[PDB]
Write a protein that binds this DNA or RNA. Structure first.
Lengths: 177, 115, 69
RNA sequence: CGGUAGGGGAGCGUUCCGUGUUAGGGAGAAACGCGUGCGUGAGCCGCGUUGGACGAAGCGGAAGCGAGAAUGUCGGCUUG
RNA sequence: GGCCAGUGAGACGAUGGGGGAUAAGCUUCAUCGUCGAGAGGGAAACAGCCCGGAUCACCAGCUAAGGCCCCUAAAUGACC
RNA sequence: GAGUUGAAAAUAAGCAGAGAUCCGGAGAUUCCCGAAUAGGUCAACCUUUCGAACUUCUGCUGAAUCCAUGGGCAGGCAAGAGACAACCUGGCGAACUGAAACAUCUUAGUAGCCAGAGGAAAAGAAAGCAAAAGCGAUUCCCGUAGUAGCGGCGAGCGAAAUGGGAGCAGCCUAAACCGUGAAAACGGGGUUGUGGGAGAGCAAUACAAGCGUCGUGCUGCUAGGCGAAUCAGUGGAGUGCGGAACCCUAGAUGGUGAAAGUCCAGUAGCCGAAAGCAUCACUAGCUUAUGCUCUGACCCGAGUAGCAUGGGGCACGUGGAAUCCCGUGUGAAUCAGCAAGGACCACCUUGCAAGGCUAAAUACUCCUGGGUGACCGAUAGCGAAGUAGUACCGUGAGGGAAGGGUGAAAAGAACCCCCAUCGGGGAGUGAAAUAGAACAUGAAACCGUAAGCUCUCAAGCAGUGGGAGGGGGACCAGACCCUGACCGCGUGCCUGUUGAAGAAUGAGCCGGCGACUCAUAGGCAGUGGCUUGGUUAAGGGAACCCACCGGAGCCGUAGCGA
């Protein structure tokens, strides 16, 4: 390939249409904006969502519930991982399953929250190959799948909350068998 | 990135050269040179369709005036009566041309339309 | 540079549902409820799709929420 | 296979840039003016007892990119 | 359905009506035709009436509406 | 190292191969006005006892008043005043606008005005974030993120924490205690945080580092120096073209009659500073200084924090309203404490306010020195390519133009004629005089002159179709161009209306300038690159772009519910 003979494929770069350059070009005269109104005048024009003096679409509808109250919205607290992410993976019979394994394998790519939401293994899909999972807690159906596969299942306690000594005393008093 | 040009003067000089013999400011003055180019071309349109129509009219009245020289009441309509009954497919009113370029031959035309 | 701002007065009213369609809460519920019917008060208690006109109006007025069509 | 508001497809031109210290050019380039030529047309090509040093095409890109209108505007020159 | 426009001042003519004074090229509706956005021919001229839907050329022919004394193409045609 | 007394020629005299002109470092003068400063002033002047006036510092004398204060006198190379485009800080601080009105809000703590100050300024060394895991001053960039929120929950406004980079630097002071003095001070000590310091007692000596007129050191800058390699023919001129050779550590650039590696100035490279400035490295020298045990007493910044109110600002508009700073008024505790962790209480965690100072990353151009430009080419680019903020206008604030290009070299026309000049024609220069000083290419409107055809019984958006008659060159002589007897037909163009030849709008004409553009995002379409999912931002880079890093983040992988 020389510097001469290079050319783009057709359809790759259309020409930008220029407006007000002749009526044979297509958008001459009023440049494709009719005759008058706010659509033809120059400026910000119309707010998108404005109904022309009518009370708008969004104001006539009541607010969504926790967003109406200002309550903090529903937020994912784990990484949802099915067993379909585990069978299609190249994990063989002897292999650990943890955070850095699923990151370094190419299943999860967590960036915005590396610190808060650990992991969770869910139920849909099967898992025939046995493994040794030391990750965070499970669903009941995924516990039925993993204990149905005969694999080493280990839940990992992540963090310990601070309990006040009178609350820890009142809870330790409740050990009445 | 200034873009002063010359293409309006060739664009305009072609239209300037077409507008010769327009008698005054229709042949010199640009802002009328344009609309005389325009009106001259549509004049060419309607005078072309009506030169078809107009030469049709001219040959009709010319062969009518040729046939009416017999004196006896033989019109132009009767020449077409006995011009299509005696099977002469479509002489196309060019007998109005050889009616003056060959008047004895159009006398042979009409004198064989009679028989 | 200048990021587009999410319109908050419609972000509190509209919502995406996984497949990618705008849903909304029906109107006429927090006012004069004895006057209505229980049939009306559970007809007006559910969240429905918004119709295509105002499904294509506010789709450009609320840019960062991943709605197809 | 008429077409206004309007929508889509395909192209011409301009100045600069890559090829480019390109081909060509004081044995006359650009300009300006010319055509019994070619195109659907925007335009191309050719000719000049004018002018005197630059600058094509092709394949590509980027625009202060195309004028007849704005009681537009700036110079020149009319009318009365 | 996706992207993406305009338009939201209409006008006359026939029918169905209301307002009027069954007055207006008046006003408002309902179905339709034209103009808008439609050239050509007939209408003397003349958006909306009739024929009619213009890709282009021909110094081609046949027709619709309408006409055949002259201006101006075609019958000073025939018979009541 | 060879000619000079600016542009800028001429004339008169000089100055100069015991080194001129010029360049560079350091000095000298600098009338008058202007901070303007001896006093006045109507700026560039007047009067003068010739004076840095005033404020500050120092010294003497020292009023009402004893000490004081004020004043006066004097000294002083004498510190400040004034100016500065933009950035920065502090204070006053809008309104048009957006909300399709408008008052809450926004525009906006922006513009403007004043003050100050530096090449940067502000901030800055945790009474901090965070959450039971951890970080370690401030600033800036990418990101989280247009998220959490705030808001007539309208218009809009919009963080922060985790993470990744640039740059890193920490130090002085008060109090408790000793000593001198009537306090007020001074000199030692101590300045820290899963606490220190003071008091009492025991040990113990030198490793390392910080600061710096002074001068030897280094490179760099402000003058410069050497510096490679060709002729000949061509229509004015050769650098272009054609023929013969060479340089390259040099083919960047500008000029030379014309375009240059070999003509010049230069460049690559090698060199070079008496003098000043700057860069880090020496130096006489000043400094920082150590560990343990006991001791809840003594201390750890008071009209301060907090509280009742009135508020401001943190994205947070008074809301549950925390943190931060102020107005009035009340008004604490010292470490067994106090403050913060978004009202508040209890526990834990974190830090030690009411005392100050600090470079870097960072923002900008009245500029300066280099290098560039899909930047302009005299209506452009700075308003300004000449007198440019000029002429001119305004009392003033202020507004504000226009005019470039003869040649290569003036070689700028000796002389003759017209003639009072201006001008013109010969001649002469030049390649060009139709390049003549109004001077380079010179288009259109506009004004003309010459040649061909044609108009004075004619109604016409000036055309067009047919074409009488006539004229011109011609070679495919039937063709082409010009004129137009007469006939048919034809309601200027745009805007904008239901409808415009319209007696609706617009334009005297000609030529230029003159309008969906740019930044960043969302969405969709078309073409790609990978699908072992994709892709980097900031930032680093042979000056920029760039190879290659840089996985922070983003998007898709799981949804439902408040």
């Amino acid at each position: 390939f020389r510097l001469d003979n290079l050319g783009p494929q057709p359809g790759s770069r259309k020409k930008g249409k220029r407006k007000g350059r002749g009526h044979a070009a297509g958008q001459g005269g009023s440049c494709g904006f009719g005759m008058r109104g706010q659509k033809s005048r120059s400026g910000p024009g119309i707010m998108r969502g404005f109904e022309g003096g009518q009370m708008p679409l969004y104001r006539r509808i009541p607010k969504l519930r926790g967003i109406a109250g200002g309550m903090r919205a529903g937020l994912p607290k784990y990484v949802p991982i099915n067993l379909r992410d585990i069978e299609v993976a190249g994990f063989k019979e002897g292999e650990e399953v943890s955070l850095e394994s699923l990151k370094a394998k190419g299943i999860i790519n967590p960036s915005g929250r590396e610190r808060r939401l650990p992991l969770k293994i869910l139920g849909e899909g099967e898992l025939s190959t046995k493994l040794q999972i030391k990750a965070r807690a499970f669903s009941g159906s995924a516990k039925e799948k993993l204990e149905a596969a005969g694999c080493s299942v280990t839940v990992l306690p992540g963090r310990k909350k601070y309990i006040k000594e009178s609350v820890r005393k009142n809870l330790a008093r409740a050990d009445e068998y | 990135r200034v873009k002063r040009g010359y293409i309006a003067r060739r664009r305009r000089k072609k239209i300037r050269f077409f507008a010769s013999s327009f008698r005054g400011a229709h042949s010199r003055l640009t802002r009328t040179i344009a609309q005389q180019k325009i009106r001259a071309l549509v004049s060419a349109h309607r005078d072309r369709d009506r030169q078809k129509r107009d030469f049709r009219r001219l040959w009709i009245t010319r062969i009518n005036a040729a046939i009416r020289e017999r004196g006896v009441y033989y019109n132009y309509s009767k020449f077409i009566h006995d011009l299509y009954k005696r099977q002469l497919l479509l002489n196309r009113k060019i007998l109005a041309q050889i009616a003056i370029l060959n008047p004895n031959c159009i006398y042979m035309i009409y004198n064989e339309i009679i028989k | 540079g200048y990021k587009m701002k999410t319109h908050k007065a419609s972000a509190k009213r509209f919502r995406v549902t996984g497949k990618g369609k705008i849903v909304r809460r029906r109107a006429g519920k927090q006012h004069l409820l004895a006057k209505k019917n229980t049939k009306r008060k559970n007809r007006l208690s559910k969240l429905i799709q918004v119709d295509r006109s105002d499904y294509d109006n506010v789709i450009g007025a609320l840019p960062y929420l991943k709605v197809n069509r």
